[PDB]
């Protein structure tokens, strides 16, 4: 509504106009800053600039005879733009599996894995806090972004694979499924961690930790690393012929899995331990000095 009759020299305030007040005739340093207003939380003031022109407008009320303000609370032109501004962002499709395919040979930087591990476990703590059930979580349900950010998705068969999927989602070698899955029990903190524990070893190896055929055979491969006892350290919820699994020793996870620092070997062995109550929680592992 103001009428520029001349311009004020260019300074910190860029282009400033000497604009006339059509009512009083007063000339004020017509200034302006380009503005946004948010904000993916929804439109609503940038308040930093609308407020700026408003402070400066407030100075007029003092008439303070040394406060050459921006002429008016308005955030208008003042010829600049528009060319309106708006942003759109790309979704990250960098599947953990893709990460692993892009990843280097056995001995994947433990420090990188530590960070990804603690990100995963941090995510789990949230998921456990929200009682998120997802024993069906597998490597491919883990996202590793371009910034190395672990994002978890696909929380159990109940809300996943609504479109074309695998015909052998279970029949496939379940080297990434907890014994409790293989025993046909349920989901738990130890179940989830057992799954990813092998995945973490996969990350180190760039290659699945275990690989069996049936659920009993899968355990027959699992047992080779974590050790095996007879029918005296098996949970109640067991569909597999517990006691028909000839006992054997463990194989120092530290030496089996590439660059597996002993502290993480311990954490992994705890995650891999057959008995879900002998495993370590996501929180405990997360807070372990290894990470």
């Amino acid at each position: 509504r103001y009428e520029p009759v001349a311009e004020i020299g260019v300074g910190a305030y860029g282009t400033v106009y000497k604009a006339r007040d059509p009512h009083s005739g007063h000339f004020v340093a017509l200034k302006s800053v380009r503005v946004p207003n948010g904000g993916g939380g929804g439109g609503g003031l940038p308040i930093s600039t609308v407020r700026e022109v408003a402070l400066l407008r407030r100075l007029e009320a003092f008439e303070h005879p040394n406060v050459v303000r921006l002429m008016d609370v308005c955030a208008t032109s003042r010829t600049d733009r528009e060319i309106k501004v708006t942003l759109v962002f790309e979704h990250v499709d960098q599947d953990l599996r893709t990460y692993l395919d892009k990843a280097p040979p056995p001995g994947l930087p433990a420090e990188t894995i530590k960070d990804l591990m603690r990100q995963f476990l941090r995510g789990l703590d949230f998921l456990h806090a929200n009682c998120i059930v997802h024993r069906d979580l597998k490597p491919e349900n883990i996202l590793v972004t371009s910034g190395g950010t672990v994002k978890l998705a696909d929380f159990g068969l109940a809300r996943i694979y609504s479109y074309q999927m695998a015909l052998t989602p279970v029949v496939v070698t379940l080297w990434y499924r907890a014994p409790e899955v293989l025993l046909q029990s349920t989901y738990a903190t130890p179940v989830d961690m057992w799954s990813v524990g092998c995945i973490f070893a996969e990350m180190f190896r760039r290659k699945p930790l275990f690989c069996g055929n049936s659920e009993a055979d899968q355990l027959g491969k699992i047992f080779d690393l974590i050790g095996l006892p007879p029918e005296d350290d098996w949970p109640r919820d067991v569909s597999l012929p517990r006691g028909a699994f000839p006992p054997r020793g463990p194989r120092p996870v530290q030496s089996v899995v590439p660059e597996m620092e002993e502290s993480g070997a311990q954490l992994l062995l705890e995650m891999l331990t057959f008995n879900p109550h002998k495993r370590i929680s996501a929180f405990r592992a997360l807070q372990h000095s290894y990470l």
Partner: protein, 259 residues
């Protein structure tokens, strides 16, 4: 003084309850599922508890009938005693099913508020503004009434447009005063320029003449585009502010001719 009734609202898509390591695109879907499964389990339990209650109710009701019959029966009072005890057991069972139902009622009281419990579709009525019947009005007859009363009604506002100079002031002015984007406005502005000439206000005349052709410009390509000027006047300001000076001048010459 008491809004505690809304302290327990569950929102499955609560975007303010997220996590950096979690993809909420699927989490929210999980939450939905969980809510549904919980309701299914709840409902099942309630129905089974109600069923059991009613079963024991009927059992004891029939036993009570039989108690009356055993009382009447000549020596059936020995059996009566036995049955009374059994009937009391059935009553106690009924009671315990009801106590469980009372616990279900307590569970309902503790139940989180959501789109399925907070409210129902009280009313819904859609409408698509198709029409208002392909027709046409004689704009000369319209102007006979409009030009005479519209122009006077908005004379001051028409003049305010004529007193503008910046393109955004003109754009935003008409954005607020969209009903001024018409021939009656432009015609007044021409007349006003003439009156300004007579009054020796040539400076104003030229400013108004500028704004005259701005409104005429709007009318010019609105007619070319076969659209209502009020639906596209902002595109004239978009064109003016972006046109290469050489073409802008050309448009202004075409415009002057259009006026």
């Amino acid at each position: 003084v008491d809004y505690s009734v809304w302290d327990h609202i569950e929102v499955s898509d609560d975007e303010d309850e997220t996590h950096p390591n979690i993809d909420t695109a699927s989490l929210f879907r999980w939450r939905h599922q969980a809510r549904v499964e919980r309701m299914e389990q709840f409902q099942k339990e309630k129905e089974e508890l109600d069923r059991g209650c009613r079963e024991c109710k009927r059992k004891v009701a029939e036993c009570q009938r039989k108690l009356k019959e055993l009382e009447v029966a000549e020596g059936g009072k020995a059996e009566l005693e036995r049955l009374q005890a059994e009937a009391q057991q059935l009553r106690k069972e009924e009671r315990s099913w009801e106590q469980k139902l009372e616990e279900m009622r307590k569970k309902e009281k503790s139940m989180p508020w959501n789109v399925d419990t907070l409210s129902k579709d009280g009313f819904s009525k859609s409408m698509v503004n198709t029409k208002p019947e392909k027709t046409e009005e004689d704009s000369e007859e319209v102007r006979e009434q409009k030009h005479k009363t519209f122009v006077e009604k908005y004379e001051k506002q028409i003049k305010h447009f004529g007193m503008l100079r910046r393109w955004d002031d003109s754009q935003k002015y008409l954005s607020d005063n969209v009903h001024l984007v018409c021939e009656e406005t432009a015609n007044y502005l021409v007349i006003w320029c003439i009156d300004l000439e007579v009054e020796e206000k040539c400076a104003l005349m030229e400013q108004v003449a500028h704004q005259t052709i701005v409104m005429q410009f709007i009318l010019e390509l609105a007619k070319s585009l076969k659209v209502d000027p009020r639906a596209c006047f902002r595109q004239f300001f978009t064109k003016i502010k972006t046109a290469d000076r050489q073409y802008m001048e050309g448009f202004n010459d075409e415009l002057e001719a259009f006026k």
